[PDB]
Symmetry: D3
Amino acid sequence: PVHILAKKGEVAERVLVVGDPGRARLLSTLLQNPKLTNENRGFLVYTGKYNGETVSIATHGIGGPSIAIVLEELAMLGANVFIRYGTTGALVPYINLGEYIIVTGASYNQGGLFYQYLRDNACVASTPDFELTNKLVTSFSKRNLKYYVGNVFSSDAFYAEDEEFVKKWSSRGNIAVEMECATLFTLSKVKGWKSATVLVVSDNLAKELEKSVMDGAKAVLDTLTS
Amino acid sequence: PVHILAKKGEVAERVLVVGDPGRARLLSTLLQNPKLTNENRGFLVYTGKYNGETVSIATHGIGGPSIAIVLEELAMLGANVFIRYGTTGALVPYINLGEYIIVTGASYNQGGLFYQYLRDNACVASTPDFELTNKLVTSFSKRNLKYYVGNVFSSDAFYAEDEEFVKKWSSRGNIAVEMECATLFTLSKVKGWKSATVLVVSDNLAKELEKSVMDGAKAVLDTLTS
Amino acid sequence: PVHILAKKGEVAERVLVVGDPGRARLLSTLLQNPKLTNENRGFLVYTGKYNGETVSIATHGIGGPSIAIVLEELAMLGANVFIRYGTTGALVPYINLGEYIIVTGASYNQGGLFYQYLRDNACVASTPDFELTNKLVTSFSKRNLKYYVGNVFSSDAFYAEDEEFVKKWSSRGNIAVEMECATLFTLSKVKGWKSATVLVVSDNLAKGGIWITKEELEKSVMDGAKAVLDTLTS
Amino acid sequence: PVHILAKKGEVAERVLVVGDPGRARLLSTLLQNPKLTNENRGFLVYTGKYNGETVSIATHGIGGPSIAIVLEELAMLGANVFIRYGTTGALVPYINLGEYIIVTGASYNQGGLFYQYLRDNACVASTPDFELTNKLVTSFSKRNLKYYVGNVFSSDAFYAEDEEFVKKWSSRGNIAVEMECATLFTLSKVKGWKSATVLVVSDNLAKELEKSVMDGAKAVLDTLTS
Amino acid sequence: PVHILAKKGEVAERVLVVGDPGRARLLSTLLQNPKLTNENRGFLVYTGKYNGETVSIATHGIGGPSIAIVLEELAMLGANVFIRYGTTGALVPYINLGEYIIVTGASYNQGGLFYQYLRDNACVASTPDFELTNKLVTSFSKRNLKYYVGNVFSSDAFYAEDEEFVKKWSSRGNIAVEMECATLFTLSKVKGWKSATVLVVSDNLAKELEKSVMDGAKAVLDTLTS
Amino acid sequence: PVHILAKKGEVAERVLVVGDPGRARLLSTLLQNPKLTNENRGFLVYTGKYNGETVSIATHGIGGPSIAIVLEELAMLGANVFIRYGTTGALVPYINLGEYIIVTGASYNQGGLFYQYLRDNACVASTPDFELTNKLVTSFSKRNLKYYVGNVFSSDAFYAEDEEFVKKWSSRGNIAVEMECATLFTLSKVKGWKSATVLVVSDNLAKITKEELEKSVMDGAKAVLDTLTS
């Protein structure tokens, strides 16, 4: 690995990945005896214990290209189970800020990354691991957390304009928008990794926060270690 | 409707759809007091009772264009819950003939039908209803049936040659190939219908039958009426 | 074949193909000693004699994927000449219900079935056999039937909305719309089969108005069937 | 028009178009009292009479962009019937040099020109006028000329390398290759012009001349004035 | 070569290419002892001396397909440096008729020609030779000519309708429109030729000539022989 | 801005952008009175003076989606001149490690980000500002640094396999590969910003120590900063 300079053996098979380095540091406090295993290029990675299992929390930056590089390098270090925990904007009015979305699939526009990996324009099913996703639903349910299950649109251009944005993607079966799920799901299917994703709603395009992230993170860690 | 000319009220909200008219007739024997509600253009549709609920078994023919027409017309008659029960060829060696595959998503090539409905080439997540699919897993498990959960490639050209067929699609996360799931899933997401699919493995491209079909049909009917 | 289950030699070299199995059965009465050679999966196929020549009438269902399978399997059984006889919706106001359209080419949207067969997105000319198509024109004019010659758009989504549907496809040189011609023509060019198509106008998308009656449609379908069969046995 | 400087009334409704200015000048001798009505930018255009009808012979240069400009400007000047008479390379063994090909359709790669005119990538049927093409067949048969009827591939890159060229295009139903038919046919369909094409085989990629060109020109002029 | 019948030794390594045969003949008068080395198919090519160097002035017609053929054939005869001198329509208000545009890149719609040469739909950077373009700036500055530096859109359909044309392309960084630069630049990069382009503004889509063409030609010839 | 949280006026009009936050910090030492104007989400941004001129040094992370967000937010904060200074893999054998490439254009695969911004699949010319790029050449030659001028392929998948990678992109006129060029150039043309790029060769795919690289990075940074404040 040329970006993640973590020593081989310092990265767990089970990894919680987040886009924000700051959330990685904050969530590391939920682990027993956390150690910083990488800080190169700002990609903070911490490894520790939780519920009798070794687990790592890694930063993936923003966007498909960035998360692809991080997943690939983490895997070269032994990682094979990934659960992304990020933030998202809801596309439907009934979902409230601070609530969660357990992702079942990701819509995306065909682009360079998918073409470079798949070698043509086929729309490969971009879905998470079935079992792992059901475990997430069980974990969030046990902790009495308000969640919704559905697909999301993984955008590559946060600031591009689209006057019909909400209607278009919500009418296509998506309940939220973010930027990395499609890449995570598809690359995982291709490489053979088990992945899933849970998102914290930080905005509603159709219409506390710190505690929201912390509570859901515990649910995710229970799933990763169960 | 111009293809399915059944009287409104003669089609249930819950519908089991199969590609073969002969399987529709055979499975109708599992219903209480079944009545043939449509015969036009060979699209046999039967309506009856099962476990205290009215249910219909409909023929959708072969291919995305055909199933799209049938789903649209059945919906115009009141149907909104669809479970396809078809046949498929496995893409991995460990799956045996007669066993089942509960579909979690469908890969497909960019095509006219999707372009016509979506209005551009976006790869919309083609996935089944999360809840309905889990009920299917529960039903098949209760009847002690051997099944596998995973994505499938929905082909539009049964006889097109591809020297790397099995390798390409199995490496893209697909465990079987059929021809209607992508259309069923995507159109359902767009229209707001709840759909799912279970397939009977009738061939293995990488490596009793009547009994298998009948057995699985019972699990599907239990799911539909749960 | 795994969909069309017919015995050895039960399928003729020349086939009249229709989408509706009910039409296959009805037209089978125009033949001598018609025999049901296949009924599996609802794809009714009949083989009999017309003007002393052996021919078959086969059901292809709806859509490119369905007709592709049927054509391939029929070819495996000995067929190499196909004339599709279906129904269509006109895209221009001057064509009336019950009249006919002899197809000269098919417009289509790229992807799926074509990408799998062609191996890339080239727009291969989707045209019928020149000679056979001219024979159809001769046959229809001989029976004093009203027909128009032109291209059609082969749609994959019957119910997909498009607010500019008629002006779009009619401005692109198409006079009607159906769902199987592009697949029939392109697959035939690649597989080495001779194909053609005649359609009965059962709706006009360019102007509102009366619906065609059952008797009217059947009479139109029957009169046209004779012209097609004459061509297939010519 | 800014390329073809001919005045209105100087261009006939019936036009025989050729790519080579030299062929236009050579064929003008078949007309009665031919007059040069344009020479700007090398696009020679002659107008005269043949068989009781006024006809023009116009140069269109090489390629889709060039012929599109010429056709558009000739039409603005009154032209509405066009028959291209060009040279081609056969893609099948049996066709001999000096023989003719009456074009029934044109295959092409989706490109800028088609996208700019059609507004999307639909594969619009690129075919000549049915009636006009049959008249050509009749005219060539009447003059006992050896011809073949079939589709051609309209290439945009004469010198682009493709090791599977002959097999690829011939297996796709094309018997020859040239560069302007697809543009002529599609644009004519959109604009409502009646067009056709006859080609002189000057090379064979799978396996006297001046006379061949002259003989076919007479047959084309007969068709144009029928 | 089958279009440009010039003999080896008759074409210089340095070539000034123009679309109009009439401009080629007009500009040949700027050369010392000009000789016509080809007129086949209207593609006039002249060869003479300028500033102690041998140079050729060649006609390329209109459009990507046509210029591709000419460039490939001139190269087969020894040419390796090409400077296109053409006409263009300004896409911004401030540029006046008769002024010049030194091209820094070309935008284009993916099309047949590019697909045939590149083998896929990648957007390969279509730029001129850096060193040569800078020499052009120097030559025009030295002769006190008013010029602008920027990208142009290379259209394939001069007459295709587009109600948002000026706004669309000018907002994409293009200050003018013409039809051959994209082909010239991309083919040159692939073949290893050194190319550049200067255009004379003959129209402005957002808002003496002989003198402008002549003055600019002298500056181009200075560049070619420096 | 929701990613780059800088106080009003803390971002200069001219910005040197780098992908590695560690490089941003390292180069901030070349400025006068450098101040950390942002650290949110790891996108370190510093503002200070060079040759008496105010400038900023900002981190853009890796990939088109990331640099697009960063450029948009810096522009909202007042920036309109961007020079990317990154690392790259050469695609031709004659370019050596530690040398520099001044970018004249960017090749890329269509889709995603470009489709969303351009609204269709047109291959819009992805080029840097002409004048700014020439100033870079002048600055590097003035400091006697070894550089090459040419196009680069902006890849979206660093680890995607391609058996003909080097031959394919080098035969298409590209002399190096990186990941943010196309997005920077194209977005800049559409948004009306002046941009350019210089890359440090850290690998050669057709065929460097920590000190060799850092020294090369440092020497080139001076030339870029000279251009930005010229």
